[PDB]
Design a protein around this ligand. Structure first.
Ligand SMILES: [Fe+3]
Ligand SMILES: [Fe+3]
Ligand SMILES: [Fe+3]
Lengths: 447, 446
C-alpha cells in the first residue's frame, strides 16, 4: 500500500511537470475525474489502458509510470547460503563445464549484481596464452572481484594482448566494463578456485542509458571524450565546455583577459592551465573549475591488488573491526571494497554508518550477527558462512561476533551530480523532491 | 521496427547482467527458448505475463523492460504555432482566468517541459504583496524564463518574504525548484505579458528519484548536504567522503602526514584546505580532489538578468549570428540560454554543434530556415514566428535568414558523471554501452 502512495505521488508529479490539473487529465485522457483522483491519492493502481492513453498525447514514456518496488522494507535484505545453492547453474565453454554461478544478495532498489562463481577449468601452467582459458566478450557491468583459492585471472590490455594474474585468497581486482576476461583454477590446488565477482552498474544504467539509446551512434559516441591520459582529459574537458559556451576564441580571450596566444597554448597541449588560470577560464565559460578538472590521475583499465598490499586499521577507536582496503580505482570514487575482521561480542550498539549502497558476504567460517535500526525499529539477524546481505544507504548498523566479511560499497545513481543537485535544492525540500504530495498550485488562490 | 530491436537488446542486457543465458531464462520463467530468442532478436514484443514472471524471480522492476520511443527520428522535431494554439488551456485562480498555457516543442527523449504562458491577470501597482497575485506552491522542475512584454515576476526569498522583479522584453531569470512564484501583467501595457517558461529536469528525475523513493525519509534526507554557503559546502563534502573511507581520524592523520591541529582547523571551519592540501586529502580518502571540491561560488536561489546585463558577441568570427547570454547559474553548469539574432543569407556550413539537449523558439516576427544533418541525411525546414523545435545533442545545424530566436541548452542526465564514466569506458565501446547486442560470452569458446 505504501507502493500505491509512492505510485500516486509519481503520477501527481507527472501531471505537475506537464502543467495538467487533475481535471485536465480527465478531459484529455477520456476518463472520469474520480479515477484520476483515486490514482493520485494512492487508492487504485493506474491501469495499463490509462498509461497507453497518456503516452499517446503527452511527451511521457511507459516506464515513467512504473515505480521501483521496495523489496527490503526493514532496511537490510539477507540471502542465505542455502538459497544461493538453489540458484546454482553450470555453464559450459568449449564443451566442458567451466563456471558454476550462484546468486547472492541483490535488491530491486540497488545496482548490485554479485555472483558466486566457481572455477571448474584447471590449467597446468600460468601462461596467459593457455588455450584452456575460455574468454568472454567483456560485459556492461563494472566488476570488483575477491579471490578465494588458487585462481588465475586472465584479462586483455587495451591493445588486445593477453595477461594473467596468479591470484590467491585475499587478492582482489577491478576490471573496466567490456574488458574481456576469464578465470581458471591452478593445477595442484586443494580445492577449486572461487571468486566473488561483485559486479554492478554505476551511472550508465536505466534512464541515462535510454537517453543515449535514442541518439544516433554518431552523435552518442561524441559524448565519450578522450580520457586516455591526464593531459588529453584536460583538453577534452576544456574543448567540450568551450563549445558549450558558444563563445568565439576572441570573445573568450576578451572575457578572460588572456591573449589569443595564451589560449592557443592551452588548446594545442603546449601549456596546461594552472589552478588560478583554470578558475578564470571556468568563470568565463559559466561553469565551475570542478567541471573543467579531470580526475587527479588516470587509472589502468584493470587494477590488480594482492592482499599483502592492503593497508589496514582498527575501527572504531574501541576496535570492534579491522578494515582491509581492497582493490579500487579513482575512476569510481564511490566504490569502496573492504575486508573486515569482526571481533566484538559485548553489545548491540550501532557503530557503522555510510551513505552508500552496501553488499556483504560472510567469507569466514563462523556465524555473525547484524544489528541495525530502520524506521524506529531495531533488528538483529544472523549472517552465517556463505550468507550475503544488502544494506540501504545511511542505515546505522554493526557486525558482532568473531569472523571475517567482504563488503562492497557503491554510489549508485545518487552520489556525485545528483547528491549535489539535491543539496542545492535545500534540505527543507528533500521530502517533496523525492516524492511530490501537492499540486503545483492551489486554484482557490493564495489570498 | 527499430523499437523492437532496441527492446530486445534491452532484454539481452538484463539477462547478461544476472548471468542468465537464453536457456537459463527459459527454464526459470517456464517458457520455450524460442520465445526468449524471439524477444531478443526483436521478432516479438515481450508479454506482460513474461515481465510479471521475471519481476517475481529476478531483482528487476517492470520499468526496466519498457524503453523510450524515439519520436524525433530526423534529429530535430518541430512544433508549429498552430499546434501550440491547439494545446491551449486557460486556468483560473481565485475564480478568474489567470494564465493561458500552450505546449511547445517537446520530445519523449528529452527532459524539456517548455510552456507558453500568457499573463491574464493585470495589476494596478508593483507591490509584491498585491492580493491579485496568485502564488503557486513551487514545483519540482527547474525553470528558466524569458520575458516578453510588461511582466512582473513574483517570487519568495528563503525567508518566505515576497518580492517582485519588474521585467520587460528580453529579460530572463532562473528559479530553483520549489521556490514559489507567479506572474502578472503590469497595467497600462498595450497587451498582455507573455513568458516562455522553459522548465526541465536535470539529475533528480526518473531512476534517481526512484532510487531515493524506496529509502526512508530519515535515510534519504541525509543525502542533502549543507550547501548554504561555500565554506559549509567544503566541510559537508569533506565529512561525507571521510565517512565513506571508514577511516578513523587517527589513521586519516597518519595517512595525510598532517598534524592534528591542521585537521581540527578543517573540521571546525577555522581554516580551509589549500589546493595542495586538498590533493593530499583526496589521495588519502581514495577519491579525486574534484570530488571534494564544491562549486566555485554559491549562487542565489533566484537569478534575475535584464537585457542590458547580457553580454553579447558575434558568432562565428565571420558573423552569421549575434549571441546574447541570458540568465544562468553555476549551480547548473550545463544549462545555457541564448537570444540569437540571425543575419545570414547564404552560408552552407553547419556552424552550430553542441553536446547538449536544445530547445528553440522563434521569438522574432520573421521566418528562419534551419539546415541540419542527421544519420547521413541532410534536411531543410522553415521555423515561423511562434514555432518551436527540439534538437538532439551534437546535431550539426545552422539558422539562416533575418530574425531572432530563443535557445535553451540543458545536459539532461548525460552531462557530468555519466559522460565522464562513458569516457573512461572508451569510445570504441560506446555502441555496446548504449545498447548491448551480443551475449557476454560465446558458449563455443574464444
Ligand atoms: Fe565478468
Ligand atoms: Fe513555474
Ligand atoms: Fe512600464
Amino acid at each position: 500500500d505504501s507502493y500505491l502512495i509512492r505510485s500516486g505521488n509519481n503520477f501527481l508529479g507527472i501531471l505537475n511537470d506537464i502543467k495538467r490539473r487533475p481535471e485536465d487529465a480527465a478531459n484529455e485522457l477520456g476518463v472520469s475525474i474520480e479515477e484520476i483522483n483515486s490514482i493520485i491519492s494512492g487508492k487504485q493502481k493506474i491501469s495499463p489502458s490509462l498509461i497507453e492513453k497518456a503516452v499517446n498525447i503527452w511527451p511521457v514514456n511507459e516506464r515513467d509510470f512504473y515505480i521501483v518496488s521496495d523489496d527490503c522494507s526493514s532496511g537490510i535484505l539477507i540471502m542465505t547460503s542455502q538459497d544461493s545453492i538453489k540458484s546454482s547453474r553450470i555453464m559450459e565453454r568449449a564443451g566442458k563445464p567451466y563456471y558454476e554461478y550462484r546468486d547472492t544478495a541483490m535488491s530491486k532498489t540497488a545496482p548490485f549484481r554479485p555472483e558466486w562463481i566457481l572455477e571448474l577449468c584447471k590449467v597446468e601452467n600460468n601462461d596467459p596464452e593457455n588455450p584452456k582459458a575460455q574468454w568472454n566478450n567483456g560485459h556492461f557491468m563494472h566488476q570488483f572481484t575477491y579471490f578465494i583459492g588458487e585462481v588465475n585471472f586472465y584479462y586483455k590490455d587495451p591493445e588486445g594482448k593477453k595477461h594473467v594474474a596468479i591470484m590467491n585468497t585475499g587478492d582482489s581486482m577491478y576490471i573496466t566494463p567490456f574488458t574481456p576476461h576469464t578465470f581458471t583454477t591452478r593445477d595442484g590446488a586443494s580445492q577449486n578456485g572461487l571468486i566473488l565477482a561483485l559486479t554492478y552498474g554505476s551511472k550508465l544504467t536505466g534512464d541515462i542509458q535510454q537517453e543515449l539509446s535514442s541518439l544516433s551512434l554518431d552523435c552518442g559516441s561524441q559524448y565519450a571524450l578522450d580520457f586516455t591520459n591526464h593531459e588529453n582529459a584536460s583538453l577534452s574537458l576544456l574543448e567540450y565546455y568551450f563549445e558549450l559556451s558558444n563563445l568565439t576564441k576572441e570573445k573568450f580571450a576578451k572575457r578572460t583577459n588572456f591573449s589569443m596566444e595564451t589560449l592557443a597554448d592551452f588548446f594545442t597541449k603546449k601549456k596546461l592551465p594552472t589552478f588560478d588560470e583554470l578558475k578564470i577560464i571556468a568563470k568565463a565559460l559559466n561553469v565551475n573549475s570542478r567541471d573543467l578538472m579531470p580526475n587527479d590521475l588516470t587509472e589502468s583499465k584493470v587494477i590488480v591488488k594482492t592482499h599483502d598490499q592492503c593497508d589496514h586499521w582498527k575501527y572504531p577507536e574501541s576496535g570492534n573491526y579491522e578494515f582491509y582496503e581492497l582493490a579500487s580505482t579513482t575512476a569510481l570514487p564511490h566504490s569502496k571494497a573492504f575486508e573486515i575482521d569482526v571481533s566484538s561480542s559485548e553489545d548491540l550498539n550501532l557503530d557503522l554508518k555510510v551513505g552508500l549502497h552496501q553488499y556483504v558476504y560472510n567469507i569466514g567460517d563462523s556465524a555473525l550477527t547484524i544489528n541495525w535500526n530502520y524506521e524506529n525499529k531495531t533488528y538483529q539477524k544472523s549472517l552465517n558462512p556463505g550468507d550475503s546481505a544488502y544494506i540501504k544507504p545511511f542505515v546505522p548498523h554493526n557486525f558482532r561476533g568473531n569472523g571475517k566479511i567482504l563488503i562492497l560499497r557503491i554510489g549508485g545513481k545518487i552520489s556525485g551530480d545528483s547528491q549535489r543537485e539535491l543539496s542545492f535544492v535545500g534540505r527543507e525540500n528533500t521530502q517533496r523532491a523525492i516524492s511530490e504530495t501537492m499540486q503545483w498550485f492551489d486554484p482557490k488562490g493564495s489570498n
